[PDB]
Amino acid sequence: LQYTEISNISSDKINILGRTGKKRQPLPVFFNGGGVEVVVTGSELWIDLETDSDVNEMWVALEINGAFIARQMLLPGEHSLCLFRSMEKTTPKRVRLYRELQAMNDDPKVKLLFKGFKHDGEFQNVPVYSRKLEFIGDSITSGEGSYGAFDDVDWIPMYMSASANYATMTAKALNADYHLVSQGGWGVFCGWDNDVRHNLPSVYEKVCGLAKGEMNEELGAQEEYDFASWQPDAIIVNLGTNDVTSFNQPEFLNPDDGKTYKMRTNTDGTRNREDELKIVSAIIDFLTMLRKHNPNAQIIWSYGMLGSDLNLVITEGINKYKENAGDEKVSFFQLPNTTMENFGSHMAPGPKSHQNAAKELVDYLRNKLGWF
Amino acid sequence: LQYTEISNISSDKINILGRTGKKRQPLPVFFNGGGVEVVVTGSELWIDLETDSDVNEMWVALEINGAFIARQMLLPGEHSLCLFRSMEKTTPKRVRLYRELQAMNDDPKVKLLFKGFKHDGEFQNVPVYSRKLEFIGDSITSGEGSYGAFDDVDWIPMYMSASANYATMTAKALNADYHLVSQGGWGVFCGWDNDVRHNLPSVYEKVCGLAKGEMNEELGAQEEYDFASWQPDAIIVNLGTNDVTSFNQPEFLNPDDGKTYKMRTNTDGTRNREDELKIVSAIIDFLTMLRKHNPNAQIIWSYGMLGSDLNLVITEGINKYKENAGDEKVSFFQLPNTTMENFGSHMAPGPKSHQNAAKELVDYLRNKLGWF
Amino acid sequence: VLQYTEISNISSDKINILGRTGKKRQPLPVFFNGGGVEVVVTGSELWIDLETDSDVNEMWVALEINGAFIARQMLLPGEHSLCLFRSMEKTTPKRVRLYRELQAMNDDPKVKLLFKGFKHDGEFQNVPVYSRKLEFIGDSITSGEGSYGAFDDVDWIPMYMSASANYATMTAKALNADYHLVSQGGWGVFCGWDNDVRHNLPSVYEKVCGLAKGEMNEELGAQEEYDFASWQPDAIIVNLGTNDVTSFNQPEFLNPDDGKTYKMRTNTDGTRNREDELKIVSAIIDFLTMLRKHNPNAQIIWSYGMLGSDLNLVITEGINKYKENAGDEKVSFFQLPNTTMENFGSHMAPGPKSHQNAAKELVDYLRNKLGWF
Amino acid sequence: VLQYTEISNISSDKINILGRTGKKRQPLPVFFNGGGVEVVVTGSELWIDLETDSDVNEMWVALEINGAFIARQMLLPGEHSLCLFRSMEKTTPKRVRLYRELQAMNDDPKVKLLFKGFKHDGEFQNVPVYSRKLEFIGDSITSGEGSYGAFDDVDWIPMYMSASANYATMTAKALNADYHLVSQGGWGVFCGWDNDVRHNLPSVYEKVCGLAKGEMNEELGAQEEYDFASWQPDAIIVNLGTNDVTSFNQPEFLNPDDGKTYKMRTNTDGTRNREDELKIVSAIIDFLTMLRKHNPNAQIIWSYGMLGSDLNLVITEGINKYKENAGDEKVSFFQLPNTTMENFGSHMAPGPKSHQNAAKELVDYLRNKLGWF
Numbered sequence A, B: 001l002q003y004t005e006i007s008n009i010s011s012d013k014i015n016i017l018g019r020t021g022k023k024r025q026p027l028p029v030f031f032n033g034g035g036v037e038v039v040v041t042g043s044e045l046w047i048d049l050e051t052d053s054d055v056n057e058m059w060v061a062l063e064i065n066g067a068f069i070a071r072q073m074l075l076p077g078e079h080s081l082c083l084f085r086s087m088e089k090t091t092p093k094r095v096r097l098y099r100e101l102q103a104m105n106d107d108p109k110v111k112l113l114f115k116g117f118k119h120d121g122e123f124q125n126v127p128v129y130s131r132k133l134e135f136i137g138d139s140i141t142s143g144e145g146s147y148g149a150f151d152d153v154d155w156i157p158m159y160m161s162a163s164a165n166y167a168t169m170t171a172k173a174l175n176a177d178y179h180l181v182s183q184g185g186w187g188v189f190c191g192w193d194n195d196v197r198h199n200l201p202s203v204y205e206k207v208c209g210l211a212k213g214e215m216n217e218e219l220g221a222q223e224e225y226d227f228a229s230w231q232p233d234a235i236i237v238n239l240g241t242n243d244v245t246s247f248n249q250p251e252f253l254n255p256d257d258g259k260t261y262k263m264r265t266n267t268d269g270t271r272n273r274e275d276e277l278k279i280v281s282a283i284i285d286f287l288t289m290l291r292k293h294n295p296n297a298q299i300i301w302s303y304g305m306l307g308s309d310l311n312l313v314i315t316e317g318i319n320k321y322k323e324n325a326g327d328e329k330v331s332f333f334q335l336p337n338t339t340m341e342n343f344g345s346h347m348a349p350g351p352k353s354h355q356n357a358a359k360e361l362v363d364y365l366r367n368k369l370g371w372f
Numbered sequence C, D: 001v002l003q004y005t006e007i008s009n010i011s012s013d014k015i016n017i018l019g020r021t022g023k024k025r026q027p028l029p030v031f032f033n034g035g036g037v038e039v040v041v042t043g044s045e046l047w048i049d050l051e052t053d054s055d056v057n058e059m060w061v062a063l064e065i066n067g068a069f070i071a072r073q074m075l076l077p078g079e080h081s082l083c084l085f086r087s088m089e090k091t092t093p094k095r096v097r098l099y100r101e102l103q104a105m106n107d108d109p110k111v112k113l114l115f116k117g118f119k120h121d122g123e124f125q126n127v128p129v130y131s132r133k134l135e136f137i138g139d140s141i142t143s144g145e146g147s148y149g150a151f152d153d154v155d156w157i158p159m160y161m162s163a164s165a166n167y168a169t170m171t172a173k174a175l176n177a178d179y180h181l182v183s184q185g186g187w188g189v190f191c192g193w194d195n196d197v198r199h200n201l202p203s204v205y206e207k208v209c210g211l212a213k214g215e216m217n218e219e220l221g222a223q224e225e226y227d228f229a230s231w232q233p234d235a236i237i238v239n240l241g242t243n244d245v246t247s248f249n250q251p252e253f254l255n256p257d258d259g260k261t262y263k264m265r266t267n268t269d270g271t272r273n274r275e276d277e278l279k280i281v282s283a284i285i286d287f288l289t290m291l292r293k294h295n296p297n298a299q300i301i302w303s304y305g306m307l308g309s310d311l312n313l314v315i316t317e318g319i320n321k322y323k324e325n326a327g328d329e330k331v332s333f334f335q336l337p338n339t340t341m342e343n344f345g346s347h348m349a350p351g352p353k354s355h356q357n358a359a360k361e362l363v364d365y366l367r368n369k370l371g372w373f
């Protein structure tokens, strides 16, 4: 078995999935859905990697020739994972290994690093994905609930995935490279619990803004992301579910400034209009940010897998943004709602809901981008 | 066989479906989906009715105990249609006979009048539908393309229906009374061919604004509708498809004022903003009209079965209206797009597309109105 | 104005007659469910002139244009001119299929449907040539009894029967095949559901329409022997056995024709009397012999299971014993999917979804069996 | 501190052992695909200590928590401590099922999987009592070969086989039933797909695990006769015949054990040699006798058709001949739905959707046959 470091595979012979920064060796795998794809001959292939964690252990999934093969947790330390063995030596196999767990904002210990491969065969040219999609979202885009029984409720890694996920289903159907940028419970303006700090726009611009602390800083997570190096055809923004929820949740005491925050509902039962306007402003500002870093991308706000109540607030944001900016490449697309037969665990979208949403999103993108 | 005129069946023993005016005997059936439901014992039931037409003949459909049984054309004259025969005399049968064809704005001859029933059994109490839904739309709500082969293109009655139609599927699922108000090719502001006269708001307030001419005037179609007599829980507005289309269609020379009308697109390929604003205004004005006549209804703009490109212009209208009016009972719900496997005739939604849209709309209404 | 063309004056190239026909050409008697005509015509307008008669059991028909369901209606006794299409674009051809929704009625000597001619402003064009041909033999499932109507409906009347929503015509359509339907609700391979030994399909198989009886039907030519040589199917689908199974759990039957009572017995533990099972086995062997005699080259396929699969072993016993003796390598068994609680129509019979499921599995089978990809 | 509890030290009411077991209790050998253990435990954390060995064909396991698929992975030789869950809410019980994905391997004396015990901070609670019991006997279909992997994949290796995506475990799960899987890819009721006459399921049925050979397996207790009285199924599902039919189209086999060549012959007209069919018929009769001997009360259901139905008449001939000769009223035939082009997995075998479809039909059948509504 030859050993080849990940950074010593020429670009035509590896697809790196997910946002990368300056660190090439070993390769930090920052986001859910991030990882590597290679095409190799030979009988045997191993990946050498390193992980660390405490409460939230790492999970990875494996696909060979586009088909789901394996999924498992990895506990802290050095690992040598066998990706395949005893295979016919002359046949090339396409191998994709990716992270199942989202980046963890409040967990500075959790990491996954790819070092290299042990192999008896040769690396071949990988498929080239000219089509690129970025997905920005909350627990739905982290695939929380995509595994696990209906009544399971523990907030732990085994229930989250990129392997059963509307975003990766969509990218696969369209033969597209994809980036996932997501955080469970977070909104465009505030988290479901009224936590104003927990908004996606605040972490969007760094390599991985959701990877904090000195270790992640050494990994290059807190540097500004090189947007010019990876420009998506479309940016799918699945946010708002948590912003809606906050209106019905208790006030949040912010330990960083001592102030309390609450999205208010009137004695009328209706949402406080000033508070809706905070979401609208957050949407205008985030769309501005997205456009600044992605000059040519079609921005598509795609929302509805867990209710559609923020439809009008979202489109108010898009409309006000596009008028002021003269931006003709921002759209709204409603995703299908998760029904009783289609829930996974955590009262979240199950695999069938993810599938339903992907079918509709793929149809929309085929027509919008002319990807027939 | 006893004869009972339609107006001589007590209200607890008949459900009249669709908008009615001053004329009660015989009963004019102005709209698609309009007609009657009774429940009768006996071996045999006939309905006596009158129809007239020229180019566009009448079509009706029959359902017994909720199940589709028959569909046929009716040519001009008096008819006696046998609804059932040779049945067990003691068992009650629920019988629903309704019009498959939309009102025809440009056809003053077409009509359908229900006179009475011939029956050996007795009329029983009918189901009571406290739930009420109004649907306002274009050819989709007229069910154009719901029947016929994929490649059929002739613009004739046989391809239209209430029998295979998302609106009636939705009402049936929710145990609701329904009214359909629809016209193929028409928009909220203009027809697909830029015909500014062809807008639904212009015909909304009359008993049947789309039934014009001397004969229809005698039927009471051009009198103002008594909205207080039938107040819906929700109003589903499926308009905009034809408004978007007009942007890519040649100018329209209006014979009523000699002026030409054209929804313009820039050399940019983008829609003329001033013309978009005309649609926004028409939407604001129409929502005002809807609220005036329906003070308590949840108004739900439901659009997307044939593309969703007007999503933002529609929601701009809804948002500006609701801000100025202080109206908290207006919503937007995007319907699923018709995909290649789901077209009917005329490149319009087939039965499967209607089914998919109904599934999503029913789910939406259950949550919105608390109809679990 | 519209031209009038008598049905018998349309050249064989410009009309497809669906279903078994006999000596009578003008007017054309339509004997069986799924029977009728297909033409392809230009013009704006098309009518069919026909005659029907009936008493308790009124005629039903259904109309398909360019392969799509359009209409379905009752027809009461007398002369009719039915408008099939109107106000259409004159230059474009339309394929028009009008067929009978109601089975032949064994006990009813009055019910009939006769096609006389077409009124048309356009021209008849050449019709599809169906080299593929399928015969379906069965009971109420093949009569599509329950394919229309609500779950709780029980009245044994015509409106609930169809060829328009029917696994057999679904199968024929998917495969681009001409089809013949020969069916009778409640009948078995050996006896009816009610133990009536007279109500068996093989007994009526050989005549033009053995199920059309009495003097009126005799003059229409129904009781003459059918000319099997004129229409040879690639496969014969035999959906029988459901009623034979049921008879074991039904009261004895007094036969008014011989005064004998007949009863398929169950043993005290609840299983079928073996000797009575053997009677069904014999009936199957004999029917397979009859089928092979009139159809020397057809693939015979016993297709059963839409309302339970309990007779599986008895059916295959009949097929195996028949085949071993005859050296017939063109007889097969294929199990159809059972109707589940979500897929019943009226009369607790297969609804449209069950018919669809069965047709899907049957179409797959036939493609592989016959080389019809 | 996590408690360690040896598997043999858990009271029988607090553990469900899935799959055939023999004399060896500590550690527990898991012989068959679908075999493993189920416990219900509180606590934040659970590990299983196990040992595996293998050469060419490495072990695969799958994990389900509260009836839901969670994980699947290979296991290379040695002792392992596999964490089944962690960081969970301490007071809530979790049902945990860990089972073997890989079939018994007839020609591989090294491959094994032994369960040693659990590490746990919580307590074992009483497990579900499965009164319902189903045995499945079959070939690669019952081994779930092709249930994972891409369409064009052909390598005959463990990663493509499963009990996690398998019509048998799907059926058992839907019916709240304990299950035993006894299967071997390529094997028939009479001979292997390659005419190998030694490769037949009946020859390995009677031992604890006849497919676990060699000294290592002999020590694990695999070659002792199975204690059938200790686990009596309500029904035995026999999915065999696919490889028997295939052999007719395959080259002759030189048997290295006796020096003779074996060939199921096909006639020049293209049909199967009858004498050779009769060998399958006899094999079926003998096997049903074997099944009845060790399972005097079980409903035996031959369930066949996921990869073609060409042997159905030969199978039912075997069943009918057995049934009449023995007076056995509790043997049935049920045809499973064929895998279509959209539903293939790897190896041109049934993919997950086909397994699902087959389970749907089989579950309906079993609900009706056994009264499990």
Ligand SMILES: [Cl-]
Pocket: B145, B146, B147, B148, B149, B150, B343, B344, B345, B350, B351
């Ligand atoms: Cl259609």
